[PDB]
Swiss-Prot record:
Residues binding Ca(2+) 1: D59, G91, G93, D95
Protein name: Matrilysin
Encoding gene (name): MMP7
Domain notes per entry: The conserved cysteine present in the cysteine-switch motif binds the catalytic zinc ion, thus inhibiting the enzyme. The dissociation of the cysteine from the zinc ion upon the activation-peptide release activates the enzyme.
The UniProt record lists the keyword Calcium: yes
Organism of this sequence: Homo sapiens (Human)
UniProt entry tagged with the keyword Calcium: yes
Shown chain mapped onto the complete sequence: 95 to 267 of 267
Enzyme class: hydrolase
Amino acid sequence: YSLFPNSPKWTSKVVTYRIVSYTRDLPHITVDRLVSKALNMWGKEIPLHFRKVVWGTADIMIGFARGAHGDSYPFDGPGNTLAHAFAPGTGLGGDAHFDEDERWTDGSSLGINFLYAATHELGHSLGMGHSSDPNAVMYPTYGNGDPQNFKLSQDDIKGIQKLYGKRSNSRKK
Ligand SMILES: COc1ccc(S(=O)(=O)N2CCc3cc(O)c(OC)cc3[C@@H]2C(=O)NO)cc1
Ligand SMILES: [Ca+2]
Ligand SMILES: [Ca+2]
Ligand SMILES: [Zn+2]
Ligand SMILES: [Zn+2]
């Protein structure tokens, strides 16, 4: 690995978040709690901390829209891509966007797991972290990778220990 032309990880030990828009399927307290639990699950492997702004854009703007929006790339609604985010490096960098049209769920049985999606998107917001593993927590297009329970599978650990470490295996793919 996940090498991109964007600074992989912010230069501060603490970052900011600003949830400009919110979903609807689950309440804002659940959005903040799932963001906080997902981010605590990221911060479980790296000593990076997160805070909220008082009056200004955060380095991790989190937003939701319902089929297209005033962004670099308009959403589609129910299908295809479910959320998208940008690599960190000030400005729009690190910010993440979600399609509220797609049915969100905390983790009950059926729907699109918010804890997984937030973890996925916030991972890119942290410092990138994609892969192509059969059960990758950042796997592109849902499949085998069980979203009900992920708690940073192997892709996340490999990304984090590749970024906040060095050692890696060779593979291509
Ligand atoms: C519920 O958790 C999910 C599941 C799927 C997706 S997604 O929107 O299909 N996803 C994978 C495919 C893809 C493909 C893209 O070309 C893309 O452009 C930036 C984004 C995505 C996203 C993604 O990786 N976002 O970081 C995003 C979050
Ligand atoms: Ca930003
Ligand atoms: Ca969609
Ligand atoms: Zn967008
Ligand atoms: Zn991704």
